[PDB]
Ligand binder design. Sequence first.
Ligand code: HEM
Ligand code: HEM
Lengths: 137, 137
Amino acid sequence: GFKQDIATIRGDLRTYAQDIFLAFLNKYPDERRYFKNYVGKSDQELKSMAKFGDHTEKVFNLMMEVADRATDCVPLASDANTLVQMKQHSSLTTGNFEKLFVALVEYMRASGQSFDSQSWDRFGKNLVSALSSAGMK
Amino acid sequence: GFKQDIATIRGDLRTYAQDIFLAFLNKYPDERRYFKNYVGKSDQELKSMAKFGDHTEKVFNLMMEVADRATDCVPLASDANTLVQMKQHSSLTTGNFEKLFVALVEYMRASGQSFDSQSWDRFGKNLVSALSSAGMK
Ligand code: HEM
Ligand code: HEM
């Protein structure tokens, strides 16, 4: 289930973080415009860029703490306040986060593994709502 | 589902509030001691005292508000805080709230109606967890 999935991804974090983030950027090529130095590059080229590995893992390290602090896939208000107040997220709307979660859940459905992709969808929806309450447009 | 149930209870709040509360006290007769003016009365004697219906309705009114504000059966931290620092609740522990929820879910299962009894179960467990986080013993 959901609590297991957190452990599964933590167990091979850099592989999953890069694979899911590439899934997102290939499914929504427009989203790359927030990520300047990723335009123009094949997946193998991004995987050899230092910043891409480093940053994507830090995104997923935090997503996993937010997921791990949640009760029934409902995140903490203070975690959503964090996400809205980060300077790197100040250009964003909840729609960007909705698209990330759609790529994430699609990735889990197509994969080998037995993820609880229905919970990840619910977590995504609860998170978008919590971002709305903390102020993000 | 859970949102329908809240509409069902609010529809006939005073009848549900009397019936569920009586179910509670009779299932857990040692809890009656908290309610000084209810000692030594039968169900029908209580249902005939206007201030019995008046208190209980107020209790279940706030319970539905807390339920309605919850996301996927998880209550707001602030609602939990209100319940702990009400001067009327000063000497209670989470065990008292657990019993009310056991009675409440048993009532729902035994009734004609199709309540989402598993979600009320989840809701009670989540509120008790929140009450302790607000420092109830
Ligand atoms: C729950 C989802 C998300 C989490 C936990 C998260 C977390 C983070 C973190 C921890 C950083 C700093 C990374 C670093 O220092 O290396 C970051 C940066 C950034 N984030 Fe997110 N993020 C999320 C969703 C999104 C979405 C959906 C977008 C936009 C499409 C986005 C856009 C950005 C941008 C533009 C940066 C700066 C670029 C970079 O640091 O590589 N984030 N995010
Ligand atoms: C989620 C559950 C509960 C809610 C929403 C709630 C709420 C309330 C409210 C709103 C009142 C004031 C009634 C009024 O002013 O007319 C009250 C009174 C009171 N409550 Fe609770 N309560 C809850 C659970 C409990 C439990 C489980 C106990 C003990 C077993 C308890 C013990 C008392 C006592 C002793 C009073 C004052 C005497 C009375 O009015 O009957 N409460 N409660």
